[PDB]
Amino acid sequence: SVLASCPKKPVSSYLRFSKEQLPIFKAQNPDAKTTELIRRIAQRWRELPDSKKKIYQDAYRAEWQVYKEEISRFKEQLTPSQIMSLEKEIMDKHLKRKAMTKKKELTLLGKPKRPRSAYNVYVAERFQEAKGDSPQEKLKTVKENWKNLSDSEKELYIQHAKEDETRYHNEMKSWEEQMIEVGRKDLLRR
Amino acid sequence: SVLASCPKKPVSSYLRFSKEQLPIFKAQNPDAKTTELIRRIAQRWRELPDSKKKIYQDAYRAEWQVYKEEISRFKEQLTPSQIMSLEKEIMDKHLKRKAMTKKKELTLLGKPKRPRSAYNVYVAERFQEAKGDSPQEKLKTVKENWKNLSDSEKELYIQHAKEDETRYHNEMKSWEEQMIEVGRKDLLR
DNA sequence: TTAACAGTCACCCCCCAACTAA
DNA sequence: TTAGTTGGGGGGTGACTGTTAA
DNA sequence: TTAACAGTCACCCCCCAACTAA
DNA sequence: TTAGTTGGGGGGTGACTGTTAA
Ligand SMILES: [Mg+2]
Ligand SMILES: [Mg+2]
């Protein structure tokens, strides 16, 4: 909101060149992957004479002066609630990024999945079957049938969830052992 | 601060017992460490019959109903800016705790200080002599003097800065080997 | 370090809810 | 308490390939 | 997982600014 | 950029001893 309307920083010399060169590179090489294009765009930039590189840098320097003005004026007109709101959206964005990043790291390290409850096994073995014109609607049907489920049938799912608790404790022991060895005792359950 | 005036959740049964016992234990054992008293308080709690622990738990349950009311009333009168401020205050406190925890740990583990620059070694030797009756004011007089320092005499501090940098590397090497024994690649790069 | 550009991909997050380890 | 787990549609995003500089 | 109580200790934080590795 | 480093005054706080439960 306040962060969305906040002036952004100008784009440095190379990225200006890249932004403009990517479409003309993509047009001439349609089935070439973007990584391949950027590799060559970067080459062209490094092979570009400094008389021309400078032109892109001068544009950036002049834009930096517009930005310095725009951000100063923007921050002067912000009320205390808007300043704290801006600070809160920045930190909230930063924490979601940092969370997502650590969830990706833990997945690459091969961290075991947490235990699947008796309800989770019911969702797994009874989702796609149940009526519903949407996944949200299908979960409500599964939840309604989970409540209506007899105590004899609940014991079928309680058992599967008991076997998954055993598999979590065994998998966590090996993973945690492995993590001590890889020098990552910080990841262990305290 | 919205958070400061925010009703706090009731203390659970053990902590109620602790709050009341600590003064009695402290009076009867004046030269005992608080840690030693809490250890004994925790044992008296463990040893307390469940008929008596249930009394402390009933107080808590009844107190939880007062809290549910007080927090509901409090949140209804909060403004969108105050709601957003409270949420920010809670998260800010949480992050400061997590930062401090990592700073204390590194200090516990004996992590060395980073390398200090020519400007740092300059304010380390001449801060005393600097004019001012406040640390903030008298540090300001060394900045305008750091600028007015000729580059020839400024070179005298950059040699002594690198003298310290070599010491930092030797301490860092010893600490990092002692940390791979703890088993923490998380603390290295 | 990391945000600043972009096309494609493959992975994560939100929501619906319930359950439960940390 | 939070967060992650079952399901997936329909959004959102870091890594990849690069350089610059705040 | 962490907030909820407390006494003591040995730090840490935040301000003023400049400088600089990551 | 951020964060940490030089200085310290003037407050703030996690570890330590513990259990409960949101
Ligand atoms: Mg997303
Ligand atoms: Mg990139």
Residue numbers in the entry:
A (entry chain A): 44 to 233
B (entry chain B): 44 to 232
What do the authors of the reporting publication say about this deposited model?
Mitochondrial transcription factor A (TFAM) plays a critical role in mitochondrial transcription initiation and mitochondrial DNA (mtDNA) packaging. Both functions require DNA binding, but in one case TFAM must recognize a specific promoter sequence, while packaging requires coating of mtDNA by association with non sequence-specific regions. TFAM is composed of two tandem high-mobility group (HMG) domains connected by an α-helix linker. In this study, we identified two TFAM residues, Ser61 in HMG box1 and Pro178 in HMG box2, that form specific hydrogen bonds with N2 of two guanine bases separated by 10 nucleotides (GN10G consensus).
